[PDB]
RNA sequence: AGAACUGGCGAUGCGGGAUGAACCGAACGUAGAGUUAAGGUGCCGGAAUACACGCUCAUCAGACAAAAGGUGUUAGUUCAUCUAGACAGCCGGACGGUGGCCAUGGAAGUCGGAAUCCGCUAAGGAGUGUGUAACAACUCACCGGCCGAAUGAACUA
RNA sequence: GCUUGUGGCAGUCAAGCGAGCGACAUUGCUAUCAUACCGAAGCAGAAUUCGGUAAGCGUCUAAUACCUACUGAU
């Protein structure tokens, strides 16, 4: 009903720092530096005591309000992302035919490789986005674990690597073949 | 083609690793996709689907009714 | 609008609403002056079997349990809302489940029962590991292989999934048997307990960790005196 | 159910014809689309008459396509005997057919087929569920009876099973006649 | 459709409606000044991209198919409780005859048939669901612990 | 401000309006053909059913649902 003024609080540990102007935002840690745009939100940003940044719209109806909460829990996860950062195990399961992985540097890009799915002959590719990092699984039959800062990111790299390789034409059911994601969590053991 | 081999083969190798993820997120897309036919699907396929709805609306109802007028005794 | 719509089930059993909360507060108040001695029991969690085998082993002194602030307030949370003079000092003492144990025993009766009685119950979260327990290197059983493997039935296949995608232990199905690529320590001595450790301990019944009701506070109904024991 | 979709057919049939000689007499654009309607409604009201038997269809069908397909006139070999007596790990090591050998009595619910080729010859095997009426015992008796093919008695010289020697033996000489 | 009704048209110019006989205005000679009706005041097109209160993101919005649906949006009515802890969220309890009685190769809450009680707990359905050949195992709805104020259900605009 | 898919009605329902009516169910005899891209289905494969986008191209085979304009040339 026309909400004179709605607010969140956003907490930053001693560990990391932002600086914030135009929707442009930086945030700095022991992690290295994400930067993100918000210039379309139209949400005005508050510190006041160099560790809480207030986050408030005036005026603004639900639709726009629902804006103010989305960019907190934005803030939020990058913040933890620097912090802890976001490790993801990706496992790869097959029945006959032993799936292959590979990482290649084909013109300098970096790109994963699928191979020997069901049989099939083609070469499958997905490039590598920035600061997602690669590594076989130790102790681990056929696990790749991602790792990188940024959430987006990393998140989007593993469902393109796990919806590359859709089961086509073939029963769901009995088919298990295929690239999952086993689970989600955080870089540092902690 | 032998017997009920799919129900032998879920049971001896299970279903897909995210079978049950799948099927948690498409129902509960369901609540949102509602929302986006009743806004689309137009033409004779909109008067179909408003019409099971409403029948379904009204199937539910009536099972509520039956229930609470039996809950009492 | 857009507002989701709260799930709704036909179940067979309605609210109980303020009623039950009111009738206990009636109920308190008019078995004050009936039993001898009150007591209120930090009873944190106590199975339902348990708690019926504590009352009829001490149905003499009838217990009572509720709301935290609704058993304050009947007892009184101070003196101008005492029901019996210093009556409201232990309802300021307790902080967990109420535990409101109405006694016509002394206080040797009640210590010297809450003293010898103890049962088993499952590790909760953060506490430490009373045992040892690691899963063997291939098919995983009921028990985990705590006990001889020549008994303990294969895992039911059928909750393979949860333990893939809610534990995050590497368990695979290998032609309908749960299988792990490695002897998984889950807990060991010493090992602070998480929520999972605690659900999966929970899911093998190692129900290894002692339990044993205790006594936060304790009110006489005729000496007007209030005494509180770390006895367990 | 088969006699019942037959005479819906006939009766839309029927219908159909009656009305297409019938709409040919109209007056007014509204009478025809009554008309029309009319033969839509009754063809409807018919296909829903069959709603159950239509469900019992497509249930039956479902279960059809999973039959084995066996040739009673080739040569075979049949193994019966007590539920999982342990002809189900014969099964399970005569040929490719993959069947659970668990402990209890009704390990296999189904006659389970396999083939395998003796001096290039083919030969199909079939696992008897069990034999203790019943539904699953009456398919195994018919199963036993009219195909062309040996019988191969099961017993349990070891307490597998849990079930004494005695029970077989009487077993085997209730349903001897017949095989 | 049977008529009576009073007006427009026929014998009617003119202004507005993008151009019409069923609409609105309108007492028709030749010129000058000033004020109006309908109709308008973004340009074509003479006149404020005037003031102020709210509504709408609409893949032909906008200048009789309709009774309903939409987790579209903005306001009210009737029932709900609420610092004895509103709603939601995270943990725990979630019993005992009982594996109730039949249905039987095997089903104990969940393959079917009817009963659906007392005993007790702040709270337990002879079970709202997931699942096992059958027990098991998870879960609601019923409460308790944490958390600190408005929320839950149907209707009127 | 025409047209498109569920035969009239006796009783049972009867949400709601307000004397009397009446939705949705129910007993009674009675604008894609194929190619292309996706979702579901006892979808093992093959083959096939239903549902959506798509009018680009075809429709025994994969399938056979007297003056202005005009192309040309000064």
């Known amino acids: ?190 | 083609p032998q017997n009920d081999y799919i129900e032998r083969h879920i049971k001896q190798h299970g279903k897909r690793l995210d079978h049950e993820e799948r099927k948690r997120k498409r129902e509960a897309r369901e609540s949102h996709k509602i929302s986006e036919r009743a806004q689309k699907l137009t033409g004779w396929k909109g008067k179909q689907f408003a019409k099971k709805r409403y029948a379904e609306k009204v199937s539910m109802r009536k099972k509520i009714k039956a229930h609470e007028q039996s809950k009492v005794k | 609008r857009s507002k989701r719509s709260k799930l709704v089930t036909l179940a067979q059993t309605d609210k109980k609403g303020r009623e039950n909360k009111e009738r206990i507060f009636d109920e308190v108040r008019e078995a004050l002056d009936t039993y001898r001695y009150v007591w209120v029991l930090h009873l944190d969690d106590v199975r339902t079997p348990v708690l019926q085998e504590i009352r009829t082993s001490w149905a003499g002194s009838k217990l009572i349990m509720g709301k935290r602030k609704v058993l304050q307030k009947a007892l009184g949370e101070k003196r101008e809302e005492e029901y019996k003079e210093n009556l409201y000092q232990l309802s300021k003492l307790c902080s967990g489940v109420t535990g409101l144990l109405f006694t016509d025993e002394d206080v040797n009766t009640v210590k010297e029962y809450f003293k010898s009685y103890v049962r088993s119950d499952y590790s909760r979260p953060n506490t430490k590991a009373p045992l040892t327990f690691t899963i063997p290197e291939g098919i995983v059983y009921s028990r985990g292989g705590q006990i001889p493997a020549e008994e303990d039935v294969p895992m039911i296949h059928s909750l393979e999934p949860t333990m893939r995608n809610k534990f995050e232990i590497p368990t695979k199905i290998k032609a309908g048997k749960i299988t792990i690529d490695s002897p998984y320590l889950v807990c060991t001595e010493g090992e602070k307990l998480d929520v999972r450790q605690a659900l999966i301990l929970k899911q093998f019944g190692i129900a290894a960790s002692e339990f044993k009701v205790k006594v936060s506070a304790y009110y006489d109904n005729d000496s007007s005196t209030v005494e509180s024991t770390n006895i367990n | 159910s088969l006699a019942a979709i037959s005479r819906a057919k006939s009766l839309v049939e029927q219908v159909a014809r009656d009305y297409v000689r019938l709409l040919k007499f109209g007056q007014s654009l509204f009478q025809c689309k009554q008309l029309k309607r009319a033969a839509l409604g009754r063809m409807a009201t018919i296909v829903k008459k069959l709603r159950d038997p239509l469900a019992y269809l497509e249930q039956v069908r479902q279960h059809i396509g999973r039959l084995p397909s066996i040739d009673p006139n080739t040569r075979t070999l049949l193994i019966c005997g007590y539920p999982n007596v342990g002809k189900s790990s014969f099964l399970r090591c005569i040929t490719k057919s993959d069947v659970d050998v668990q402990p209890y009595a009704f390990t296999t619910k189904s006659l389970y087929v396999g083939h395998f080729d003796y001096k290039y010859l083919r030969f199909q095997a079939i696992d008897t569920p069990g034999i203790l009426m019943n539904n699953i015992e009456m398919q195994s008796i018919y199963a036993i009876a009219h195909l062309r093919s040996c019988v191969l008695y099961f017993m349990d010289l070891s307490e597998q099973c849990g079930f004494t020697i005695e029970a077989q033996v009487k077993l085997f000489h209730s349903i001897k006649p017949l095989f």
């Open chain 1, 1 to 190: 009903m026309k909400y004179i003024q709605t607010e969140q609080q956003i907490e930053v540990p001693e560990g990391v720092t932002v600086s914030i102007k135009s929707r442009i935002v930086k945030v700095v840690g022991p992690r290295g530096t994400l930067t993100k745009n918000l210039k379309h939100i139209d949400v005005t940003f508050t510190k006041v005591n160099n560790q809480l940044i207030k986050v408030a719209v005036h005026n603004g109806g639900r639709k726009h309000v629902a804006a103010l909460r989305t960019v907190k829990s934005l803030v939020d996860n990058m913040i933890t992302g620097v912090t802890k950062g976001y490790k993801y195990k990706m496992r790869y399961v097959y029945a006959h035919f032993p799936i292959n992985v590979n990482i290649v540097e084909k013109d300098g890009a970096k790109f994963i490789e699928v191979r020997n799915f069901l049989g099939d002959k083609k070469i499958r590719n997905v490039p590598v986005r920035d600061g997602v990092t690669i590594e076989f699984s130790t102790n681990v039959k056929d696990e790749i674990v991602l790792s990188g800062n940024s959430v987006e990111d990393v998140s989007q790299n593993a469902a393109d690597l796990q919806q590359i390789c859709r089961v086509r034409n073939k029963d769901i059911r009995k088919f298990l073949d295929g690239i999952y994601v086993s689970h989600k969590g955080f870089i540092t053991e902690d």
